[PDB]
Amino acid sequence: TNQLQYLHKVVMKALWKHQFAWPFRQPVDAVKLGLPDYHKIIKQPMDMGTIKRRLENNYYWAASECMQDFNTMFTNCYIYNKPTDDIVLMAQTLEKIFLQKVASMPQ
Amino acid sequence: RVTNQLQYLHKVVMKALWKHQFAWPFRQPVDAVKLGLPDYHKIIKQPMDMGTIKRRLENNYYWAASECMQDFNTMFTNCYIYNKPTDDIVLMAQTLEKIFLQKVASMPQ
Ligand SMILES: Cn1cnc2c1c(=O)[nH]c(=O)n2C
Ligand SMILES: Cn1cnc2c1c(=O)[nH]c(=O)n2C
Ligand SMILES: Cn1cnc2c1c(=O)[nH]c(=O)n2C
């Protein structure tokens, strides 16, 4: 659909190449990153690589379901990490852009 | 006068969230003394709540939709950052934020 195309072509593109986006481009690998408690706390892992691939395979039926995936990703970061971690600031900056771009989604 | 987006945020988004059965912990600013959380303002530097947003929507404080959207987001993000992952209020915020998101997916302009 139209909104899904916008979420792919405008929203995701602007988030993907942002200088803070690299921690969010691929699933958290808790082994490599030394986070053995990650999957005990985050029961619904999400990342922009998963969302992008889903957008490119007609996984989503509605824009709502893609935006919910974006929100889960960010919320996972706020929930798991300490308030003072830089990745909290990185997620907030990206989430602001997502909300701005979403406010301009076609209807 | 009021833009279509702020009409929508007020008439659709704030209407749904204010009357919601999980809304009540978010209707007024966190009172750290009444709630007994003496670190709250040490961790949370920009407090947000639905009462403030509701008032800002009534008194045309916002210049753009994304500005009201940001306040909603800050309110929810404060909750996820400050509280423990297992606190019930986190899942109350998640339920309200999912509605917020669903509604803004049909915002005009
Ligand atoms: C999404 N992501 C990617 N890398 C990380 C995270 C995270 O949430 N916490 C965290 O500590 N690290 C290293
Ligand atoms: C403190 N407390 C505990 N439960 C509640 C409240 C309240 O203030 N409003 C309210 O609606 N509910 C259910
Ligand atoms: C927004 N709000 C309202 N009441 C609370 C909170 C909170 O963030 N944590 C928290 O623990 N409590 C009790």
Curated annotation (Swiss-Prot), chain B:
Effect of mutating Y80K: Loss of homodimerization
Binding site for a protein: D39, Y82, N83, K84, D87, D88
Consequence the record notes for mutating Y40A: Abolished binding to histone H4 acetylated at 'Lys-12' (H4K12ac)
Compartments, record wording: Nucleus; Chromosome
Domain Bromo per the UniProt entry, residue ranges: 1-107
Superkingdom of origin organism: Eukaryota
Comment text on domains: The first bromo domain specifically recognizes histone H4 acetylated at 'Lys-12' (H4K12ac). It also specifically binds histone H4 acetyl-methylated at 'Lys-5' and 'Lys-12' (H4K5acme and H4K12acme, respectively). The second bromo domain recognizes and binds histone H4 acetylated at 'Lys-5' and 'Lys-12' (H4K5ac and H4K12ac, respectively).
Quaternary structure and partners: Homodimer. Interacts with E2F1. Interacts with (acetylated) STAT3; promoting STAT3 recruitment to chromatin. Interacts with CTCF; promoting BRD2 recruitment to chromatin.
Family: Belongs to the BET family.
Function: Chromatin reader protein that specifically recognizes and binds histone H4 acetylated at 'Lys-5' and 'Lys-12' (H4K5ac and H4K12ac, respectively), thereby controlling gene expression and remodeling chromatin structures. Recruits transcription factors and coactivators to target gene sites, and activates RNA polymerase II machinery for transcriptional elongation.
Further remark: Some specific inhibitors of BRD2 that prevent binding to acetylated histone are promising therapeutic molecules for the treatment of cancers or inflammatory diseases. ABBV-744, a small molecule, has been tested on tumors with success: ABBV-744 antiproliferative activity is mainly restricted to cell lines of acute myeloid leukaemia and prostate cancer and is able to displace BRD4 from chromatin. GSK046 (iBET-BD2), which specifically inhibits the second bromo domain, is a promising therapeutic small molecule for the treatment of inflammatory and autoimmune diseases.
Protein name per the record: Bromodomain-containing protein 2
Record organism: Homo sapiens
Whole-protein coverage range: 74 to 182 of 801
